[PDB]
Structure 1
Amino acid sequence: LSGKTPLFAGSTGGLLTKAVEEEKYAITWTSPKAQVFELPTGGAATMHEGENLLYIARKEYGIALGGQLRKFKITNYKIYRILPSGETTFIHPADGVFPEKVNAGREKVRFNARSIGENPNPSQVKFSGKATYD
């Protein structure tokens, strides 16, 4: 990962021991202009003119931040999951496309080819290791 940290004095709201012993998340974005943006956990910060990088505790902070970045006409925001062993994984735009847009590569997952009323009764599925939502 490469980028600059946003300029802010620091805050109690931020990374805790989970980042060291468990997963920590990181978010990248590139802005043409330096503006003040509210951080996910309290406070405000400025953003450099190129390759801003921020570390965040959970995945929810990044997309919540990305929604704020979209207000400033920024869309090249990516999120990474950094494990304690240093393994990094590029996740949120898993493909070059965003999730709301459609792309041919993706496949449907846990799609129930029926209406919700057609699900079986629970008594019909007991002591079988299955559920009605299957």
Structure 2
Amino acid sequence: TLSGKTPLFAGSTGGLLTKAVEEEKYAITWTSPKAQVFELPTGGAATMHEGENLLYIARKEYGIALGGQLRKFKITNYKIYRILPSGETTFIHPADGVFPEKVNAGREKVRFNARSIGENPNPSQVKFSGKATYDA
């Protein structure tokens, strides 16, 4: 599914546990101009390869911490995948193809409230109704 070389480190005990085989698993891919040393989110030092890299991780936050670190190495082509135990690989970051800090067309407003927050109703007005005060 995913093409890449595992970075060079002698293994840690901070890697990925039984949740990977039973619940969900993440992968990060990036390419590097040269081979250089980076820090794992699990702890420890590892050498990335000159070329395509692949590093399986337990949480998505590990991949976004690593992708924030890879920007210091001037590497902005990183991709984060979500892998299920069925083998289902889905592409989540960046999902649109553009990083979320930049505006891209085709994105819609999700969970936008067209009022200020002091204009939310009282909790007693929404009591027993099954809705929250901040809904809609």
Instruction: Give the TM bin, normalised by the shorter chain.
Output: over 0.9
Q: Give per-residue Cα distances to partners, 1:87-129, cap 9 Å, x unaligned.
A: 0000111112100000111000010000000000000000000
CA distance in structure 1 between the aligned counterparts of 2:79 and 2:90, rounded to whole angstroms: 11
Question: What are the within-5 Å matches in structure 2 for residues 41-52 of structure 1?
Answer: 41-52=42-53
Question: How many residues align structurally?
Answer: 134
| Cα displacement (A) at 1:80 | 0.2
C-alpha separation in 2, matches of 1:26 and 1:96: 17
CA distance in 2 between partners of 1:46 and 1:35 (Å):
5
- What SS is found at the alignment partner of 1:71? coil
SS at match of 1:80: strand
In 2, the alpha carbon distance for the partners of 1:93 and 1:66 equals: 11
Match of 2:24 in 1: 23
Partner deviation per Cα, 1:16-55 (whole Å, 9 max, x = no partner): 0000001000000000011100000110000111110000
Q: CA RMSD in A?
A: 0.5
Query: Which ranges of structure 1 fall in alignment gaps of 5 or more residues?
Result: none
Return the structure number with greater strand share.
2
State the alpha-carbon separation in 1 of the partners of residues 50 and 83 from structure 2: 25
How far apart are the structure 2 equivalents of 1:48 and 1:92? 21
**Is there any run of 5+ residues in structure 2 with no aligned partner, and where?**
none
So what's the TM-score if we normalise by structure 1? 0.99
Secondary structure of the residue aligned to 2:71 is helix
Which residue in the other structure is 1:70 paired with? 71
Q: Distance in 1 between matches of 2:33 and 2:7?
A: 14
Cα deviation for residue 131 of structure 1 reads 0.6
Matched, 1:82 2:83: yes
Shift >4 Å, 4+ stretches: none
In structure 2, C-alpha distance between the alignment counterparts of 1:84 and 1:96, rounded to whole Å? 25
